[PDB]
Design a protein around this ligand. Structure first.
Ligand SMILES: [Mg+2]
Ligand SMILES: [Mg+2]
Ligand SMILES: [Mg+2]
Ligand SMILES: [Mg+2]
Ligand SMILES: [Mg+2]
Ligand SMILES: [Mg+2]
Ligand SMILES: [Mg+2]
Ligand SMILES: [Mg+2]
Ligand SMILES: [Mg+2]
Ligand SMILES: [Mg+2]
Ligand SMILES: [Mg+2]
Ligand SMILES: [Mg+2]
Ligand SMILES: [Mg+2]
Ligand SMILES: [Mg+2]
Ligand SMILES: [Mg+2]
Ligand SMILES: [Mg+2]
Ligand SMILES: [Mg+2]
Ligand SMILES: [Mg+2]
Ligand SMILES: [Mg+2]
Ligand SMILES: [Mg+2]
Ligand SMILES: [Mg+2]
Ligand SMILES: [Mg+2]
Ligand SMILES: [Mg+2]
Ligand SMILES: [Mg+2]
Ligand SMILES: [Mg+2]
Ligand SMILES: [Mg+2]
Ligand SMILES: [Mg+2]
Ligand SMILES: [Mg+2]
Ligand SMILES: [Mg+2]
Ligand SMILES: [Mg+2]
Ligand SMILES: [Mg+2]
Ligand SMILES: [Mg+2]
Ligand SMILES: [Mg+2]
Ligand SMILES: [Mg+2]
Ligand SMILES: [Mg+2]
Ligand SMILES: [Mg+2]
Ligand SMILES: [Mg+2]
Ligand SMILES: [Mg+2]
Ligand SMILES: [Mg+2]
Ligand SMILES: [Mg+2]
Ligand SMILES: [Mg+2]
Ligand SMILES: [Mg+2]
Ligand SMILES: [Mg+2]
Ligand SMILES: [Mg+2]
Ligand SMILES: [Mg+2]
Ligand SMILES: [Mg+2]
Ligand SMILES: [Mg+2]
Ligand SMILES: [Mg+2]
Ligand SMILES: [Mg+2]
Lengths: 119, 82
RNA sequence: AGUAUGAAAAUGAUUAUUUUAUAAGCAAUCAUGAAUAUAUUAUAUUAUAUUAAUGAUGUACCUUUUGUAUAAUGGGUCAGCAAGUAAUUAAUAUUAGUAAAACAAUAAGUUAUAAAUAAAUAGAAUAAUAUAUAUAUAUAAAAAAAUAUAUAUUU
RNA sequence: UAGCCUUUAUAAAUAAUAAUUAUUAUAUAAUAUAUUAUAUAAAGAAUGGUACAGCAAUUAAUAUAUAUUAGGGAACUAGUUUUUUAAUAAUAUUAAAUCUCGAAAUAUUUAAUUAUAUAUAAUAAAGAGUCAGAUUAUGUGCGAUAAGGUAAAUAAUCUAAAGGGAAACAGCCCAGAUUAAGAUAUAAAGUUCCUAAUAAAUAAUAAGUGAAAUAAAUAUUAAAAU
RNA sequence: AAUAUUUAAAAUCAAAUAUAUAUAUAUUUGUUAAUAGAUAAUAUACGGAUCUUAAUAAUAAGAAUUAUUUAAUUCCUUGGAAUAUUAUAUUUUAAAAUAUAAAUACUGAAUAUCUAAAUAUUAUUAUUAUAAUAAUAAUAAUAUGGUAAUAGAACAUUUAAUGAUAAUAUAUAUUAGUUAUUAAUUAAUAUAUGUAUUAAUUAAAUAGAGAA
RNA sequence: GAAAGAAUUAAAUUAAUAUAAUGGUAUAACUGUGCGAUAAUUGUAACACAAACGAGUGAAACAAGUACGUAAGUAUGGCAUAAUGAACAAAUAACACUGAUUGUAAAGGUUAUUGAUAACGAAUAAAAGUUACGCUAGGGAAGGGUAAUAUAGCGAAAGAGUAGAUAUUGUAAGCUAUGUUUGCCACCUUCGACUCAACAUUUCCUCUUGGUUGUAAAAGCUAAGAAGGGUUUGACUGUUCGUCAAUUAAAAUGUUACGUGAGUUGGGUUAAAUACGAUGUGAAUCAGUAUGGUUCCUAUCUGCUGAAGGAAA
């Protein structure tokens, strides 16, 4: 290994904060998507925008992917997530079966919340 | 109701399927704002690119001209010709 | 190796301005003091020009390579010279001329005007769009594959 | 030659790209134990056999004061018991590139709908170049679970991409330079000084451990929980 | 206290979210540290300085390491409210009371916006003179890194065809201006020439050299 | 209640399939049996799959004829996926198409068939070696990485040690370091001697110290600190190495382009000459042996050794 890819094995505090913020943003996006759908469905039934926003009973999304994203068991929120799953991917060939998320290529775009139950 | 979607991240490190989805959605460059009438189809498409994009719901959409007008900064002066 | 002329450059010496004897690397660019020069509108607290205070950024150029600051190629510098051109043809395209004809006008020829078929004495609505017709295979004649021909004016 | 690139055009043109709907079940309401609507749940039309999971059949491995089949010993007067040797059965437990009876996600992929049209496909007439590739990540073959190794699979970047970060850096993290301007949002990465930018909270460390390239079995000393 | 394990949130408990809801069901989260082991040849090598805090005593420092977090702290549902803080002003006796503010952490690209300029296309205009056009100028949008390659548009140079003009001119050179500038033009200065095969349009090329 | 039939359910594709392996097959594609021996036929084949082209694959339908079946229908070889070869040039037939003045002919064409190019998209009907006498065009189409090996260490301790695993020893298996050996990779196209050495410490000697029923003493053995100083001369060989001789306090191990050829040498390795043994028909060749035998360099910069001038004191 003569070429030096000087990437540290762990993240800095600032990196971790940025990661957390990014995670929070994707959750927010999902929430917005569900909310807009609900609003649209209220409008279709025949309420005003404000009335729809007020509504006690929020409509859950019917499409599959959205419904999965909504579930925390499948796609957890940043507040829900463990410290470890925010900053460590599962890597079967690593010692500890764990690897920094920053070592994943395009980790800033690519999402990866859920690790295996005991790894 | 309308999703105001914004292409927050670039499409440089992004695979080709996700690029194609972004193109279909209508977003060109980074930070280029697009309003979309809400429906299941557009919602699913947005979910597919959830990490590149910032979405927020709105009462009304805005045409490109309106958006431009909103953007324009205040010229702090009033011309008086003589 | 003509004759004039020659502030063309490389190159040498000298003078002037400016910087330089505690500072380290493509010697430039950008920031920025100072010094000097010029300026018949510097009215100035001015403008331009020249100059390695000081600060920041800055890994020659080409070639060949997956990849070159490379200790890979090539160049001492400047001046001059040094590389997709012609002929005879064919196919496309664009325009222009003429146009069911064109070129040529002496005739002759080339292309077009009919599609086929290895080739032969075969060759396009019997009452209309293919469901008709022509050709090649086949045949008594159709059907069948293929391509072509037809819905005031021929293309 | 095809693949990928370019130019000029053609339409009774959207055929392209992306997603949704499509299914199953439950509850509620309305009609005729069925149908429709609404809401919710379910990795949700069709195709599949990798991961995972599993030991079924196949191929392999282990154990039985268990049973049967024979054999070798052994005690009394050929019969009999025990300590057994293998095989077979029974029961329990295990694994495999060429085992999958269970089984994902990603994937392949169809209709209509919506969204992309200052956008795509297809076709027609013409021009190319290229066929030494590299690294990173993931899943493998070879190698020794060695190589800046080698061989291909998928994605990205470099190739041909300047800019910010990673001390310096082809391939990593961001992000694509038409020309400026420099007020505002920022990305990745940073905020004691060098060096543009910082203040807090709660724990732990005392080894300069560490502070952007994490060195192992094991040992000692503590600390919690039982 | 002693012996022996484990270093765990599966179970268990605690806390939080979602469905009927003072409870039940389902989901999500929470379970050690230090040292030794430790190791080669130009020179210490976190990039370097340097970083672990301390009462008296500061209008003042107290990780710049590791782990979990925040953008002053606490409740309620990004937002408001309360709480103290900090700074400031006023009033009263260096303190107290009142009120105003700050709470949007910041840096950061050739990213995006704004601000202007250019070209190209699409869609609207305006002005001036296939007028369904051309030129120029507006507005909105999209696009403009590029090797191999493809396509489009220009300029310099030399010759041929046509061709005014003139030493107050032309050409070449130097210096300083000008025009979004390989080019040309203005002025000054110099040297030549009684003068552009000149401007412009065509036709062509021994038509552009830091790379053999 | 009994007999017979029709059968259904469960299981099975582990047998069998002309033939490998895979998929399929009991609704059988497997097996038996009647007829038959035909469809192991003739012209057009769309449309798909696959696909650079050349080819390859499935195939509806139309037309002619055939075999089986009461009929429905089925058959354009085999349950499927291998069982193969272009043109050119010859050859054989059929076709009635051309017939170089006309007629015949020849010769060519169409249709069907034939043999191989296995380096198997086949260059020709037909082609092996050698060069250290070689030549031209190009390409690189010890250092670096690795650490299997090697060297060193650690953990655990079977076992030796008169008794006791751990004074000293330490099987096989375990965890590391090193980049000193032999390899592997292919980014990257000279051994020894002399001379002068610089550095490391994993210490051979000298200094300090722990352990040593195996430290009585003296010699040792083993371990910790320690790089200040020191660490060989000869015979043999080109050798480093090694064997030995004589010494020494000791004759340590490396790194430095296995330091040092613009500093020396040139014995080894190395081309031209020649011979020997072996190999080859031979030219010639060799992880062979032997004699002979070719590079040079005035120092520009860095650096180092000395010596001046200038200077800001
Ligand atoms: Mg000085
Ligand atoms: Mg110097
Ligand atoms: Mg050099
Ligand atoms: Mg060079
Ligand atoms: Mg040279
Ligand atoms: Mg016939
Ligand atoms: Mg090609
Ligand atoms: Mg469609
Ligand atoms: Mg497999
Ligand atoms: Mg199965
Ligand atoms: Mg290749
Ligand atoms: Mg490689
Ligand atoms: Mg290249
Ligand atoms: Mg770059
Ligand atoms: Mg690119
Ligand atoms: Mg761009
Ligand atoms: Mg340290
Ligand atoms: Mg380090
Ligand atoms: Mg739990
Ligand atoms: Mg060091
Ligand atoms: Mg640092
Ligand atoms: Mg920009
Ligand atoms: Mg461009
Ligand atoms: Mg020339
Ligand atoms: Mg020249
Ligand atoms: Mg040039
Ligand atoms: Mg068979
Ligand atoms: Mg079988
Ligand atoms: Mg296909
Ligand atoms: Mg084909
Ligand atoms: Mg059969
Ligand atoms: Mg031949
Ligand atoms: Mg004749
Ligand atoms: Mg061949
Ligand atoms: Mg071949
Ligand atoms: Mg060949
Ligand atoms: Mg041959
Ligand atoms: Mg010889
Ligand atoms: Mg090495
Ligand atoms: Mg013993
Ligand atoms: Mg051993
Ligand atoms: Mg003694
Ligand atoms: Mg030592
Ligand atoms: Mg001393
Ligand atoms: Mg001697
Ligand atoms: Mg050497
Ligand atoms: Mg030398
Ligand atoms: Mg040298
Ligand atoms: Mg002699």
């Amino acid at each position: 290994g003569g070429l030096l890819w000087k990437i540290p094995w762990r993240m800095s505090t600032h990196q971790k904060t940025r990661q957390r913020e990014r995670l929070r943003n994707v959750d927010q996006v999902i929430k917005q998507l569900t909310l807009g759908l609900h609003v649209q469905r209220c409008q279709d039934k025949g309420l005003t925008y404000q009335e729809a926003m007020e509504s006690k009973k929020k409509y859950k999304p019917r499409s599959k992917s959205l419904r999965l994203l909504n579930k925390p068991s499948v796609f957890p929120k940043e507040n829900q997530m463990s410290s470890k799953d925010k900053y460590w991917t599962f890597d079967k060939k690593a010692v500890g079966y764990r690897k920094g998320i920053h070592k994943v290529p395009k980790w800033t775009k690519i999402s990866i919340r859920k690790a295996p139950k005991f790894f | 109701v309308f999703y105001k979607v914004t292409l927050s991240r670039s499409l440089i490190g992004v695979p080709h399927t996700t690029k194609s989805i972004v193109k279909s959605l209508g977003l060109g460059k980074r930070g280029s704002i697009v309003y979309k009438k809400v429906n299941p189809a557009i919602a699913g498409s947005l979910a597919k690119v959830k990490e590149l994009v910032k979405v927020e719901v709105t009462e009304h959409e805005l045409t490109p001209s309106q958006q431009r007008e909103l953007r324009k900064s205040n010229p702090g002066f009033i011309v008086e010709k003589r």
